[PDB]
Amino acid sequence: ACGLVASNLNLKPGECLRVRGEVAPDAKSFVLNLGKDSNNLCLHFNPRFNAHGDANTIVCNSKDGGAWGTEQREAVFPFQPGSVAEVCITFDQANLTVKLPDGYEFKFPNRLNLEAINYMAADGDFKIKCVAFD
Amino acid sequence: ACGLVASNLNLKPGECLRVRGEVAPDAKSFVLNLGKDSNNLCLHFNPRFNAHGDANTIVCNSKDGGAWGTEQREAVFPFQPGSVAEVCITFDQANLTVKLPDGYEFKFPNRLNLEAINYMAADGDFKIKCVAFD
Ligand SMILES: OC[C@H]1O[C@@H](S[C@@H]2O[C@H](CO)[C@H](O)[C@H](n3cc(-c4ccsc4)nn3)[C@H]2O)[C@H](O)[C@@H](n2cc(-c3ccsc3)nn2)[C@H]1O
Ligand SMILES: OC[C@H]1O[C@@H](S[C@@H]2O[C@H](CO)[C@H](O)[C@H](n3cc(-c4ccsc4)nn3)[C@H]2O)[C@H](O)[C@@H](n2cc(-c3ccsc3)nn2)[C@H]1O
């Protein structure tokens, strides 16, 4: 809503989106949304420090034609409130791969089968400093 | 327009936007548009290598509620086709200042007196690699 929105990204399979930002000292959560547009998201990436009953959990989901998909959570949580955080995303036909701080990586199934990622929105307690394409 | 569009930038006076991109190998021109939205641009920055009868000339303009303003042209042209260009943009009450690390500096009057820059668009023969806020 107040976070950075970017469109016409034209990110193709195998290309790296690198995002760096500042996690607020009192962060509750933040969101990186990636897909075609606000209703069609091949990845909703939502680290929760303390939000919706979740402590230090990464929640991921997709959104297809307005409808949220089946949620998935990861065990690993390498984000700290009040510090700078970089996240690196790529995709292929089968999966999105997200590489985190501390060398941590995980896959989320690609559920939309889009030609490219064209849309990104940040929200929550995360101030983007830097976005790069590779 | 078909290159990157970014909104909710909330760049305030004194803050630096840095953009790095690739100038196509037979570039005719590129555009960086900065402002409130597509119809309200405090800076339309348009380096022309060979386009609309202009050769190696920078053309700047504003747009205010859909209406183009008066063109301002600059003599110096520190860009080359097929290379990497970095541009640093800031503003204050009187002027926008477009800077290059190579020491070139252009001023354009701040004709719209907007309080923040919230919108940035790239078009033409220029691919954005990196955008940073500080
Ligand atoms: O239908 C109810 C569900 O609500 C969702 S919360 C919902 O989830 C979305 C992604 O699936 C987005 O993340 C959506 N969001 C968050 C933001 C946001 C965050 C920061 S700025 C904007 N912008 N949209 C956020 O509101 C919980 O995750 C679900 N849940 C809870 C638990 C649980 C609790 C304790 S132990 C297990 N297990 N599943 C369940 O309760
Ligand atoms: O309508 C006629 C005028 O057209 C404009 S071109 C018009 O100008 C805009 C900013 O004023 C934008 O730049 C606009 N653009 C360019 C792009 C673009 C570029 C790359 S991707 C998209 N997206 N909009 C671009 O179409 C010429 O500039 C005018 N001109 C040139 C000269 C001249 C020649 C030698 S000395 C003086 N004397 N008049 C004149 O011909």
Swiss-Prot record, chains A, B:
The modification N6-succinyllysine is found at residue 107. The keyword Transferase does not apply. GO terms for molecular function: lactose binding; laminin binding; receptor ligand activity; RNA binding. The modification Phosphoserine is found at residue 29. InterPro entries: ConA-like_dom_sf (IPR013320), Galectin-like (IPR044156), Galectin_CRD (IPR001079). It is found in: Secreted, Extracellular space, Extracellular matrix; Cytoplasm; Secreted. A beta-D-galactoside binds at residues 44-48, 52, 61, 68-71. Keywords: Acetylation, Apoptosis, Cytoplasm, Extracellular matrix, Lectin, Phosphoprotein, Secreted. The keyword Secreted applies. It holds the Pfam family Gal-bind_lectin. The modification N-acetylalanine is found at residue 1. The modification N6-acetyllysine is found at residues 12, 28, 107, 127. Expressed in placenta, maternal decidua and fetal membranes. Within placenta, expressed in trophoblasts, stromal cells, villous endothelium, syncytiotrophoblast apical membrane and villous stroma. Within fetal membranes, expressed in amnion, chorioamniotic mesenchyma and chorion (at protein level). Expressed in cardiac, smooth, and skeletal muscle, neurons, thymus, kidney and hematopoietic cells. Its main location: secreted. GO terms for cellular component: collagen-containing extracellular matrix; cytoplasm; cytosol; endoplasmic reticulum lumen; extracellular exosome; extracellular region; extracellular space; galectin complex. Residues 3-134 form the Galectin domain. GO terms for biological process: apoptotic process; cell-cell adhesion; myoblast differentiation; negative regulation of T-helper 17 cell lineage commitment; plasma cell differentiation; positive regulation of apoptotic process; positive regulation of canonical NF-kappaB signal transduction; positive regulation of inflammatory response. Lectin that binds beta-galactoside and a wide array of complex carbohydrates. Plays a role in regulating apoptosis, cell proliferation and cell differentiation. Inhibits CD45 protein phosphatase activity and therefore the dephosphorylation of Lyn kinase. Strong inducer of T-cell apoptosis. Plays a negative role in Th17 cell differentiation via activation of the receptor CD69. This is Galectin-1.
